[PDB]
Amino acid sequence: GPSRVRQNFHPDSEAAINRQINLELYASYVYLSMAYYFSRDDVALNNFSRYFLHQSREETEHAEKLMRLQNQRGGRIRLQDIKKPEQDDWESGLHAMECALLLEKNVNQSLLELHALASDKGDPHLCDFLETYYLNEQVKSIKELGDHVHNLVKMGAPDAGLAEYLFDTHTLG
Amino acid sequence: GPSRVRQNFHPDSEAAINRQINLELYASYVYLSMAYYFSRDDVALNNFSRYFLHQSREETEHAEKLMRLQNQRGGRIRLQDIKKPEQDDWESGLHAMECALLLEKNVNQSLLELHALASDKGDPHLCDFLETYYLNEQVKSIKELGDHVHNLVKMGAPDAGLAEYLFDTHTLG
Amino acid sequence: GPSRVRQNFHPDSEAAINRQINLELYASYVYLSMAYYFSRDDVALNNFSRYFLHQSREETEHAEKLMRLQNQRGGRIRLQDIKKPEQDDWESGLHAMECALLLEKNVNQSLLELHALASDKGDPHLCDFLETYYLNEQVKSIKELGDHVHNLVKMGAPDAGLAEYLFDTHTLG
Amino acid sequence: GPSRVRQNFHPDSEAAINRQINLELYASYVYLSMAYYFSRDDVALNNFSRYFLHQSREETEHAEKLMRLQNQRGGRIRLQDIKKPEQDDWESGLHAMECALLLEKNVNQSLLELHALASDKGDPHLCDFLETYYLNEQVKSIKELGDHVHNLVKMGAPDAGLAEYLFDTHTLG
Amino acid sequence: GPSRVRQNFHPDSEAAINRQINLELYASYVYLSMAYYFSRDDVALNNFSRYFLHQSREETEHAEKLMRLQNQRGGRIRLQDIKKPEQDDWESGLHAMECALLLEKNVNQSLLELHALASDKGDPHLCDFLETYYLNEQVKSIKELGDHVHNLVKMGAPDAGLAEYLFDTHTLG
Amino acid sequence: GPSRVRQNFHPDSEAAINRQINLELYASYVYLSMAYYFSRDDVALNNFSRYFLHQSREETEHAEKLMRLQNQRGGRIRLQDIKKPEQDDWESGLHAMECALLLEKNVNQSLLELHALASDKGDPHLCDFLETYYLNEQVKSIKELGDHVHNLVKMGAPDAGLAEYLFDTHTLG
Ligand SMILES: [Cl-]
Ligand SMILES: [Cl-]
Ligand SMILES: [Cl-]
Ligand SMILES: [Cl-]
Ligand SMILES: [Cl-]
Ligand SMILES: [Cl-]
Ligand SMILES: [Cl-]
Ligand SMILES: [Cl-]
Ligand SMILES: [Cl-]
Ligand SMILES: [Cl-]
Ligand SMILES: [Cl-]
Ligand SMILES: [Cl-]
Ligand SMILES: [Cl-]
Ligand SMILES: [Cl-]
Ligand SMILES: [Cl-]
Ligand SMILES: [Cl-]
Ligand SMILES: [Cl-]
Ligand SMILES: [Cl-]
Ligand SMILES: [Cl-]
Ligand SMILES: [Cl-]
Ligand SMILES: [Cl-]
Ligand SMILES: [Cl-]
Ligand SMILES: [Cl-]
Ligand SMILES: [Cl-]
Ligand SMILES: [Cl-]
Ligand SMILES: [Cl-]
Ligand SMILES: [Cl-]
Ligand SMILES: [Cl-]
Ligand SMILES: [Cl-]
Ligand SMILES: [Cl-]
Ligand SMILES: [Cl-]
Ligand SMILES: [Fe+2]
Ligand SMILES: [Fe+2]
Ligand SMILES: [Fe+2]
Ligand SMILES: [Fe+2]
Ligand SMILES: [Fe+2]
Ligand SMILES: [Fe+2]
Ligand SMILES: [Fe+2]
Ligand SMILES: [Fe+2]
Ligand SMILES: [Fe+2]
Ligand SMILES: [Fe+2]
Ligand SMILES: [Fe+2]
Ligand SMILES: [Fe+2]
Ligand SMILES: [Fe+2]
Ligand SMILES: [Fe+2]
Ligand SMILES: [Fe+2]
Ligand SMILES: [Fe+2]
Ligand SMILES: [Fe+2]
Ligand SMILES: [Fe+2]
Ligand SMILES: [Fe+2]
Ligand SMILES: [Fe+2]
Ligand SMILES: [Fe+2]
Ligand SMILES: [Fe+2]
Ligand SMILES: [Fe+2]
Ligand SMILES: [Fe+2]
Ligand SMILES: [Fe+2]
Ligand SMILES: [Fe+2]
Ligand SMILES: [Fe+2]
Ligand SMILES: [Fe+2]
Ligand SMILES: [Fe+2]
Ligand SMILES: [Fe+2]
Ligand SMILES: [Fe+2]
Ligand SMILES: [Fe+2]
Ligand SMILES: [Fe+2]
Ligand SMILES: [Fe+2]
Ligand SMILES: [Fe+2]
Ligand SMILES: [Fe+2]
Ligand SMILES: [Fe+2]
Ligand SMILES: [Fe+2]
Ligand SMILES: [Fe+2]
Ligand SMILES: [Fe+2]
Ligand SMILES: [Fe+2]
Ligand SMILES: [Fe+2]
Ligand SMILES: [Fe+2]
Ligand SMILES: [Fe+2]
Ligand SMILES: [Mg+2]
Ligand SMILES: [Mg+2]
Ligand SMILES: [Mg+2]
Ligand SMILES: [Mg+2]
Ligand SMILES: [Mg+2]
Ligand SMILES: [Mg+2]
């Protein structure tokens, strides 16, 4: 108290990073839920399942990088409960993709708020960290999900019998 | 309703598997907390950190295998909040190992209760699943942690200045 | 309207990116003009030609990266006419290098203005994009052209009979 | 004045080659526009995008070969503005293919007019150049685009939800 | 006067970069002093020596990158005397590590001040340069030294006879 | 006091070695200054820059070997400030080479004085060390610089426009 490493690291930034860690862990859990929805016997879209599982693992990596940042800067990780996702039944491939797009935009907004706080506190290391490892990746993820939503809508998902199947086998395959 | 795949799968077993999924996810989170405790600048035992991180990832795999089992048998995954661990500050290498041993025994007791329920419901597939993938692994984990606790105690942890350092560098290295 | 991907992306930034796309395409065209000046039978400096052709292709890549950014962020590309360069006859190796240096400084000033707008609009993704892919590259290009102008001046270009020839064969070779 | 290389090269041919250079650069720009239309989040047909990008680059190569011809024969390149394409929004995969077919026929007509001028001026080198590098390539391009238009029409583009998607993934993939 | 390359480069930034060059050269010299302290016959901790020598060489690289930046931006390097370190006798492995941690924090503070000046002068190229090559590296160095100080303190350095020896042979080996 | 290793090592020799360490570090700094003079945008002789940078690194190695000798013999390194070089602007390739030749002769004279002291104190180990690692290397360096000065003078440096450029590209390339 303080850490022998701590420098130019505001307590508000430390707290905001703890909040972001929880949100990335929550996102990981939402994608985990989606992954195992798509491997139900009455859904059986294995490539949607693999897509969401990969996204889940990426979110865990994002959480871990923030935990490492907390330690690097001499802050103290404070974990909270990881809330369950809003649904177990994700209804359709299109619905899951739409929910994932909304989740990614919400996480993006949180990251932009974190960056604005880091700017306000004159913490260029934290600003650079978010820019280098988070902001670019979030924009790419949002774009990819937007693309997938568009194709599924155009193809006639969820009601058109062939749309999610063909998307599963071509795009996600 | 029911699943076209469901057979000899009691609703109580389905619910018990959902409870076990939550407990494995909780264990994953406890070990994640421990991993990042050991990479604090004022702890700095990197091999303890890597040990706990590996345990965290194993618990996620255990959770996922149960989720796959739920789908295979035609049950429906129902996720709940993942409670935060009991501590962020795990005090010492020995304390963390002792807490991990207790956690593993508690998870073991839950698995034995699950096996007893599966037996009572005449579900040999579920009994076999727990025996093949869980019970053996739990006994090995408990034994390993017992071994680590013993050596740390004998070496004079946590107060002896060299004990956790030497254990970090030899056994966990 | 708006794009399902669009977030924190101001219309002024979208318009400024369209202006920058046109300027990079214009730069590509200036360097293309220079490349084919140096392969005239009455100029015949093949390494100057290859140097400018490479610069032309780089500018097209810079334009394309901005077009991709526009799509990633949910803006809409709006192309305009690519104005012809100021000259077809670039007079000499030194003159071409001096014109290229001026062009690069002018494009740099535009990029700095874009960055200032992105800052004003609180768009750290766009700020990071320009910093990562544009600002560094522009400074290196300006420095390289400054170096080439200096050596050509010192060597006695354009009037000294051996200067552009020797520069063509050593530095650009 | 004249070039020490110039021989049997009529001023009208020199001017016509400059006009053709501009038209090939214009075609390159139309295909560039189309490429980035197909990577919009609300179009998201990546293989259409890659197809048009490849066509764009080919047109630049066609422009460059004419610029090299101008220099080889001792003419002087005179560049003009590259007009923006007729649209930024290309409406659909089928519409883009139909516009590309029309563009290729228009460029073909220009090349045939160039060949007729070269014939009239008794310039067999220029006639041979167009025959060897242009006329054959144009016929193949027109045929390919005709084939793609036919399949898209037959499949029910643009309104049939699966047609452009399936064409993107099979033919252009 | 000014450099033909200079653009958006304030004289205060140029002077601040010259000051930072001197500080990095000074840090290189402090670590050089420490390296050869640890190879004294009455200290003889070869891995501490190699650790500090490596840090010395890194600081020279940091100085050189700033010198290159000065030239890239058209500023003029102005070198000053490199002051001798505060000690020749660094007392112990722990003391050296503590002095190195303080040095790194002091250099970090200078870099943050440089970044704040670059921000104030609207120099995003210089801001990006410090973020990309300096700020991240400084945080990692401070964290590593904090970790080493902690382990040496816990192990009972400097008075405990085995602590620096065991640290030399395990962590730095 | 004395070192358990010290034998036949006079205090005057120990002090003279400390003086020589400072002079080699000073030479390293002069060559560093020269290296970055040659990469200025208004000098831009990259091979002169690389030549001087290599010489700088060699001088650091010479300093380090003396520091190791001090430790080997049980003397104590005492560092002093490294004075800045006499110039930041080195005027021309020829001027830099002439200044480097003078520096090398001055360092040589210091080494000969050190050898004479070692002889006077009956220290054949120190005499052998200077002969084996220093005297030969100094003579070769002086000869190389003499050769470079001669060619630059003969070629008409610094005023002849092609001389330093051609020397940069042939001899130093
Ligand atoms: Cl702080
Ligand atoms: Cl909570
Ligand atoms: Cl800041
Ligand atoms: Cl898609
Ligand atoms: Cl849509
Ligand atoms: Cl059943
Ligand atoms: Cl709960
Ligand atoms: Cl049974
Ligand atoms: Cl053990
Ligand atoms: Cl015990
Ligand atoms: Cl040991
Ligand atoms: Cl927006
Ligand atoms: Cl216009
Ligand atoms: Cl911002
Ligand atoms: Cl140059
Ligand atoms: Cl000049
Ligand atoms: Cl003619
Ligand atoms: Cl026009
Ligand atoms: Cl003919
Ligand atoms: Cl086809
Ligand atoms: Cl048809
Ligand atoms: Cl300026
Ligand atoms: Cl001073
Ligand atoms: Cl700025
Ligand atoms: Cl450590
Ligand atoms: Cl401590
Ligand atoms: Cl003695
Ligand atoms: Cl002094
Ligand atoms: Cl002797
Ligand atoms: Cl020579
Ligand atoms: Cl001479
Ligand atoms: Fe992803
Ligand atoms: Fe990843
Ligand atoms: Fe990945
Ligand atoms: Fe994330
Ligand atoms: Fe709840
Ligand atoms: Fe995400
Ligand atoms: Fe930045
Ligand atoms: Fe394990
Ligand atoms: Fe495993
Ligand atoms: Fe394992
Ligand atoms: Fe487990
Ligand atoms: Fe709670
Ligand atoms: Fe476990
Ligand atoms: Fe059994
Ligand atoms: Fe059994
Ligand atoms: Fe370039
Ligand atoms: Fe490139
Ligand atoms: Fe390149
Ligand atoms: Fe550019
Ligand atoms: Fe005009
Ligand atoms: Fe450029
Ligand atoms: Fe920034
Ligand atoms: Fe030559
Ligand atoms: Fe083609
Ligand atoms: Fe081609
Ligand atoms: Fe091709
Ligand atoms: Fe063409
Ligand atoms: Fe127009
Ligand atoms: Fe074409
Ligand atoms: Fe380091
Ligand atoms: Fe390095
Ligand atoms: Fe390194
Ligand atoms: Fe440094
Ligand atoms: Fe002093
Ligand atoms: Fe440092
Ligand atoms: Fe950055
Ligand atoms: Fe050991
Ligand atoms: Fe040398
Ligand atoms: Fe050497
Ligand atoms: Fe060497
Ligand atoms: Fe030397
Ligand atoms: Fe002085
Ligand atoms: Fe020397
Ligand atoms: Fe000898
Ligand atoms: Mg939250
Ligand atoms: Mg429970
Ligand atoms: Mg413009
Ligand atoms: Mg036309
Ligand atoms: Mg200072
Ligand atoms: Mg001296």
UniProtKB/Swiss-Prot annotation, chains A, B, C, D, E, F:
Top EC class, one word: oxidoreductase
Enzyme Commission code(s) on record: 1.16.3.1
Impact upon substituting S141A: Increases ferroxidase activity and iron binding
Protein name, per record: Ferritin, mitochondrial
The keyword Metal-binding appears for this protein: yes
One function term, GO molecular function aspect: ferrous iron binding
GO CC, one annotated term: mitochondrion
The keyword Iron is annotated on this UniProt entry: yes
Coiled-coil residues: none
A GO biological-process term: intracellular iron ion homeostasis
Functional summary from the UniProt entry: Catalyzes the oxidation of ferrous iron(II) to ferric iron(III) and stores iron in a soluble, non-toxic, readily available form. Important for iron homeostasis. Iron is taken up in the ferrous form and deposited as ferric hydroxides after oxidation.
Binding-site residues for Fe cation 2, renumbered to this chain: E59, E104, Q138
Reaction(s) the record says it catalyses: 4 Fe(2+) + O2 + 4 H(+) = 4 Fe(3+) + 2 H2O
Annotated keywords: Iron, Iron storage, Metal-binding, Mitochondrion, Oxidoreductase, Transit peptide
Complex and partners: Homooligomer of 24 subunits. The functional molecule is roughly spherical and contains a central cavity into which the polymeric mineral iron core is deposited.
Family membership: Belongs to the ferritin family.
Domain Ferritin-like diiron: 7-156
Record-listed Fe cation 1 binding positions: E24, E59, H62
Coverage span on the entire protein: 64 to 236 of 242
Tissue: Detected in testis and erythroleukemia. Expression is very low or not detectable in brain, colon, heart, kidney, liver, lung, muscle, placental, spleen and small intestine.
Main location class: mitochondrion
Annotated compartments: Mitochondrion
